[model samples]
Target: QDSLSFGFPTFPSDQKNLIFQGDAQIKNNAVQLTKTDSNGNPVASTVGRILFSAQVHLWEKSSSRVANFQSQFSFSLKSPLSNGADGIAFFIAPPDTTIPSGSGGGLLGLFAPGTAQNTSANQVIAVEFDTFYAQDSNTWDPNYPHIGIDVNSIRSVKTVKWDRRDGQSLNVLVTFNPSTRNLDVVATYSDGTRYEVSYEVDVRSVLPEWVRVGFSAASGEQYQTHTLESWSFTSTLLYTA
Candidate 1:
């Protein structure tokens, strides 16, 4: 199959293939996911979540045996005082374009509380930039402001303290090579410092053949704004011998 690619330096309203659910908007040529109302006023108690996805499948689910893909995006999470609550995530989920309901704050808009643990029908594989830590328990839980890789559950398979500052532009790249079935995530901070993590995932085992690729973010009692400055994704279908 031919490679599929897309980039968004700024969002255009006529891009009907792009789906924005919940509080997400296309403003000033970027994707604004949270902190909808505050322009300079104090952001009060609010819970906002947004899910942005491509209307078409990332690959051919029917004919493909394997796939190799790479995606990169630039983003900024900001608040009035460098204190933003909640966080953002990159994910591959079922074709449902709807944002996860009742999923804000620590959940990062990816999964509901118990749904993640069910596992039987779980359909999300994500990497999250988590900024708030409401609990001190749980082995997979990292301290405030961390990065995690979530497979079907909000609990991370690996967690690391993220060195990202509010308002600074950050870059993240996620890639998968079917030959090794290794999924790698690398994040470059504004200062040029980079961190990386990797996981073994067989796409056919965890995700549907034709899945949606996109992002989701949420803000809870402590509010902040999450914005996508730019994004690029490319996917290639692979075959078996």
Candidate 2:
């Protein structure tokens, strides 16, 4: 079985294959996708991201065979305020992906606000845990805390309410089944509330043969602390040339 795999119950201090961006850092053996101030508090209005440093093989070129992948990660959100405006996402993007030029407010740093919604140039596929609702037509949020699957755009192809703001440990399992061409998410809050959602996304058309996987989060004026506690992932292609 040719596979790409890793299991980090907790991240090590010195990470060679882990890249942190914006306010993201490793602290207390977990990834903090927000800055902790000298006052020992999470800073507001900031963005953070952490990704697998190397690009992973997503599809075989000549065979056009997509890889089946499964990833599970544990995280928690600590919202000091009554409302934490933004949220987090687990995404697969082009290897050259970055914090889309001066982002951080609501797009979760996954989609560039200035670009066209479905531009292939901005290749992004993400499952987001969102807390705020932006009322604009372009934003078209579900008007509540929700989980959404975003393609190239921040707009979700499908969504379900996400009401986990207790700051306790929450876990999410995401799987891409090549046979069904379905990207699926099963998220469970600390209270054991679970939700399952899926969307048909043909990776052969949306993403490149190779892609990077990771998490990105942001805090706005209304903020919270986002923490990624542990992660495990594996990808396999049944038949490869």
Candidate 3:
């Protein structure tokens, strides 16, 4: 992985005070991370992850549901061969251990119901870049499911398939640009290349300003679990503080 600096000027006024400055600390064989000042912080082999402790909303809370939270981090996995270990997903959910493993959908192994995602108002939004398929044809997608986005409610909001799934390193950047009030989600391969599936979210109307943002990847009974090299966010605030 490479060192990444998350500079910001587009975030809302309320969010601008918190800065993810300095280096991210790595310890315990690179499985965990911490942050410190120049002299106080030690550099590791690769870019260490910086965790934003502040929580972000994941779901609509008005309907008696526990909203999800989003967090951001950046890291990489070692890949020698073609098997891409599946892919990573961006998640925002309540901090709990009771996450449901949706049936046959490989639903991030983080949901309760099967295919009726978004049926319940209390659901998390997961922009999953999947490579594994769990159900039969017509049950979900009939195109031999490779990659797609999912909404983890009692079911899946939707899944968009990819053309290829042999495996590749990826760069995923999702920004809630407070400037335009638009949420932009971009995905690219290891070489700074992007896919056609890149999307944007209109936070002004779709989501709240204060929300959690993070990434996740998984594998099913067969494939190697995908790894998240690194993920981060930059918001140019457009809304009033």
Candidate 4:
């Protein structure tokens, strides 16, 4: 097969074709990326991920042609009033990847603490919806809800502000075009406003032929609930003989 495809309009009772780690789980037919307490408030300093159980083919051996992929999902975030910690990401990583140690908060479960940044050893590509700013030259997160693209590290390569304080659910689309080597993200606000971010990167140079695709989220001292309502993905590779 030249392609991989799946869709979940609403997550089912069973965990078919899916792998959940950390605090992630399907509750009431929705994906909750963080643990909730008795009152349904998200736990602090939490980290979690939801991934496809199978590996996706990203390239060929001899020809070295890369894949083109696209994904979209519906999600919402809720805090006590307004403020909250870190954020959520739609990410792709090396095969057999998991939540790394000390990845809570700004790390967003993709990188381990004390690990190097912006290198192929980390093997991650993500589109993040960040809500908090962890001040430092390392993280350098902007103090606003923004959409960022991360490759190999938590540090975003590009960023654009997202007006998300209105407590409305968002629909997001992320796509990678190998022909152009561009990763593009478009997020829609509840009232039909659109914000877009784009960056150029060759996926084959960083990730292996087989990779895991998923969604990850994390919280810090200030916390909030991140709910994923639905998700779908498709990928296709062209081979040269």
Q: Output the number of the lDDT-best candidate.
A: 4
Taken over the whole model, the C-alpha lDDT of each candidate is 0.72, 0.83, 0.39, 0.84
When summed lDDT is taken over every stretch of 10 residues in candidate 1, the lowest stretch is: 40-49
Ranking by TM-score: 4, 2, 1, 3
Structural similarity to truth (TM-score) of each candidate: 0.87, 0.93, 0.53, 0.94
Task: Give per-residue CA lDDT, model 2, range 134-224, as digits (tens).
Answer: 5763266877889999888877889998786656888999999988888989998766889899999888788888889999998767677
Best by TM-score: 4
Measured with C-alpha atoms, the lDDT of residue 106 in candidate 1 is 66
Model 1 CA deviation exceeding 4 Å by range: 38-64, 136-140
lDDT of 3: 0.39
Compared with the true structure, what per-residue lDDT tens digits does model 4 show for residues 48-134?
899898899988777767788889898988888566766889998887898998888888888887773646568888999888874
TM-score of 2: 0.93
* Candidate 2 clashing pairs, residues 3+ apart or interchain: none
Clashing pairs in 4: none
What local lDDT score does residue 235 receive in model 3, on the 0 to 100 scale?
A: 33
Please give the TM-score that candidate 1 achieves against the real structure: 0.87
